[PDB]
Design a protein around this ligand. Sequence first.
Ligand SMILES: CN(C)C1CCN(c2ccc3[nH]c(C(=O)c4ccnc(-c5cncc6ccccc56)c4)nc3n2)CC1
Length: 258
Amino acid sequence: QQYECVAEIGEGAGKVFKARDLKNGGRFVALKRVPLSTIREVAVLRHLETFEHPNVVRLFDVCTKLTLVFEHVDQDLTTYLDKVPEPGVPTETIKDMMFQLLRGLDFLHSHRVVHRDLKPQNILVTSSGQIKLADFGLAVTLWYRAPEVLLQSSYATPVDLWSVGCIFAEMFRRKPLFRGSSDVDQLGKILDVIGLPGEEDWPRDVALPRQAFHSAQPIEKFVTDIDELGKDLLLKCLTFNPAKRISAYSALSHPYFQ
Ligand SMILES: CN(C)C1CCN(c2ccc3[nH]c(C(=O)c4ccnc(-c5cncc6ccccc56)c4)nc3n2)CC1
């Protein structure tokens, strides 16, 4: 094959490797090796590539079980936070990274792709500080799961803005905001902070009823340095109700990004 594995990046639900692209100057690429639904998902990927959005990982090739060649990025958001000098991330650097993050999200929503598992472990940061979304559009941590996914009720795009707020926060905290040991625990951790939602905000026909939990806390506690504009925006990303939750397109126009 034209490529040559030099290491593994990680494994999960598939397998991703770091390699050399021998035909293109020995640059680093990323190889993943994984039925119409599959053909379908790849058709979308190939399609999304055409637009070449700066805030999503480039697709270089699809080898004919199935190998997908993407670009390689030196690090993810997680190692960027581990290795970040004290006492954190420059307010301005957060404001910028979030924007780039929201850009690719709107780009993905606008084409009706839902990431479904957006966590800092697949948010890639390049040499220049360019955010690039990885690990999407193909078939451990619930800390970034949205309430409705936890309740197993709605699976639409509002899911990924819940994750955005969770990441937004962590960019201040440098530690995950809600660390739960399981789906019920997780759901608890969330409601301890945002407060019990209105009774009509609980989706119907879900095994978990509103009565199985027990008041809202102020946000500046768990997240310090956050401005009013950060606060307000962050609150509309973590609205319990997916219909009341903000959207990427709507987020891009928040006063916070002025
Ligand atoms: C200490 N060592 C182990 C550190 C080396 C630097 N580092 C990373 C981490 C993630 C990284 N992704 C990448 C990529 O280039 C890349 C490009 C396109 N798609 C993916 C991708 C595809 N499918 C599923 C995925 C699931 C999660 C994340 C990415 C996925 C990855 N390079 C990374 N380098 C941290 C550990």
